[PDB]
Design an enzyme around this catalytic site. Sequence first.
Site, short mmCIF file in Angstrom:
data_model
loop_
_atom_site.label_atom_id
_atom_site.label_comp_id
_atom_site.label_asym_id
_atom_site.label_seq_id
_atom_site.Cartn_x
_atom_site.Cartn_y
_atom_site.Cartn_z
N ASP A 62 -9.22 -1.71 -7.55
CA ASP A 62 -8.33 -2.01 -6.54
C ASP A 62 -8.05 -3.42 -6.34
O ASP A 62 -7.05 -3.88 -5.98
CB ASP A 62 -9.38 -1.83 -5.37
N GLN A 110 -3.60 -16.90 -3.36
CA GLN A 110 -3.77 -16.45 -4.59
C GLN A 110 -5.01 -17.39 -5.08
O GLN A 110 -6.01 -16.85 -5.65
CB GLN A 110 -2.86 -16.21 -5.70
N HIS A 139 0.84 -1.34 0.17
CA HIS A 139 0.04 0.14 0.01
C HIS A 139 0.78 1.42 0.10
O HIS A 139 0.63 2.02 0.84
CB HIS A 139 -0.98 0.01 1.21
N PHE A 180 -8.10 -16.51 -3.17
CA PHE A 180 -8.50 -15.33 -3.24
C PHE A 180 -9.25 -15.09 -4.80
O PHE A 180 -10.25 -14.49 -4.68
CB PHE A 180 -7.13 -14.36 -3.24
N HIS A 222 0.67 1.67 -5.99
CA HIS A 222 -0.56 0.72 -5.89
C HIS A 222 -1.58 1.92 -6.11
O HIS A 222 -2.43 1.44 -6.79
CB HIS A 222 -0.91 0.36 -4.37
O1 LIG Z 1 -8.03 -4.74 4.05
C1 LIG Z 1 -7.40 -4.29 2.78
O2 LIG Z 1 -7.63 -2.95 2.78
C2 LIG Z 1 -6.93 -5.06 2.12
C3 LIG Z 1 -6.93 -6.48 2.32
C4 LIG Z 1 -6.42 -7.37 1.38
C5 LIG Z 1 -6.01 -6.88 0.09
C6 LIG Z 1 -5.41 -7.85 -0.65
C7 LIG Z 1 -4.75 -7.38 -1.83
C8 LIG Z 1 -4.20 -8.36 -2.63
C9 LIG Z 1 -3.59 -7.87 -3.87
C10 LIG Z 1 -3.08 -8.70 -4.55
C11 LIG Z 1 -3.07 -10.03 -4.34
N1 LIG Z 1 -3.73 -10.49 -3.44
C12 LIG Z 1 -4.09 -9.59 -2.31
C13 LIG Z 1 -4.68 -9.77 -1.29
C14 LIG Z 1 -5.02 -11.21 -0.86
C15 LIG Z 1 -3.97 -12.12 -1.18
C16 LIG Z 1 -4.20 -13.49 -0.80
C17 LIG Z 1 -5.40 -14.05 -0.01
C18 LIG Z 1 -6.54 -13.02 0.02
N2 LIG Z 1 -7.67 -13.60 0.18
O3 LIG Z 1 -8.57 -12.48 0.33
O4 LIG Z 1 -7.80 -14.66 0.43
C19 LIG Z 1 -6.27 -11.67 -0.43
N3 LIG Z 1 -5.52 -8.98 -0.38
C20 LIG Z 1 -5.92 -5.52 -0.04
C21 LIG Z 1 -6.54 -4.59 1.06
MG LIG Z 2 -7.76 0.26 0.87
ZN LIG Z 3 -6.34 -0.14 -2.49
#
Ligand SMILES: O=C(O)c1ccc(-c2cc3cccnc3c(-c3cccc([N+](=O)[O-])c3)n2)cc1
Ligand SMILES: [Mg+2]
Ligand SMILES: [Zn+2]
Length: 334
Positions: A242, A293, A84, A296, A88
């Site tokens: 995002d 990932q 962040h 996700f 980004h």
């Molecule tokens: O609370 C927040 O503000 C927040 C939380 C998570 C992400 C985020 C970004 C990613 C970007 C690129 C790959 N992965 C991202 C992930 C992420 C990575 C692995 C697993 C998961 N997931 O949700 O299971 C999420 N999370 C961004 C913002």
């Molecule tokens: Mg945010």
């Molecule tokens: Zn963001």
Amino acid sequence: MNIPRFGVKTDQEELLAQELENLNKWGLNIFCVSDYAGGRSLTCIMYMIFQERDLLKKFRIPVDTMVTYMLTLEDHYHADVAYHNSLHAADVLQSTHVLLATPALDAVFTDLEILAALFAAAIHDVDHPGVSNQFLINTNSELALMYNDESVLENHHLAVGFKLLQEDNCDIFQNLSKRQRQSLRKMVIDMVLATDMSKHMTLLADLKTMVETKKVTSSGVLLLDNYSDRIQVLRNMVHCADLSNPTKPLELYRQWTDRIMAEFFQQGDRERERGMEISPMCDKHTASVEKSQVGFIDYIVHPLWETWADLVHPDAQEILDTLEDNRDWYYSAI
Ligand SMILES: O=C(O)c1ccc(-c2cc3cccnc3c(-c3cccc([N+](=O)[O-])c3)n2)cc1
Ligand SMILES: [Mg+2]
Ligand SMILES: [Zn+2]
């Protein structure tokens, strides 16, 4: 002050000029832009997007005021945060810039709505501390108390983004009328608050409902007659941008993934240090990048984009295909 060719100083003006030819493309490589822009990816990309859309002239935004605010905004993203940081922000901004030009939405939004969406994207994560809302809540931090544990970071991003407009020569909206300023602020608050991941499921559910009664003209262009529908589309647009990392070329996606995991892992190490429950995927001793990932994409990212693709069919088919290809790669990489 001096206004460089591409908004920022650079010792590789030709390489930068080269990469910027992709300004309006999903394929743009923000990482290279950052290298050539001396780390001022947000100030550069934003300067170029505003020139590209003739927004400075359209809203009578003094160029030195625009660059001053942008430099100030970028200065307020933390360089010590792995994911962040300003890169980004620049990426989400640039991505939103591309999504705004999708054929299905041609001539749908006014210049003011477009201005709001880009501004929102640019400030959506400003002054991010590199830790989640829950971490701030669990530590009884000043921010969580300030915002009643609700969309803590998102509320803060908005407060900062707008507050910085008051630093010397930073009010880029000085020449907008009062009604325009208020409309813009209302829309921006709406879009940034919608970036709070805890609102994701509801957002997607409402988006699908909207797609159900989707209205289109002869050319196939979306029909958004009321404010409600326009802002709903803009909320989701920013949210998708995002969460667009998985839809980008594998080479870029992998870099974004290493950054997020590094940020998650550091939050985990800190939670461990303070005797706190370690947040999901933040334990480097057990969490897997590839595994994370796939999940996700499977339960968050693909469902969202699949619905977006549905909304602007078939404009995002290519983006969807890439997401599926990347899903395949990470899965096989497990
Ligand atoms: O609370 C927040 O503000 C927040 C939380 C998570 C992400 C985020 C970004 C990613 C970007 C690129 C790959 N992965 C991202 C992930 C992420 C990575 C692995 C697993 C998961 N997931 O949700 O299971 C999420 N999370 C961004 C913002
Ligand atoms: Mg945010
Ligand atoms: Zn963001």
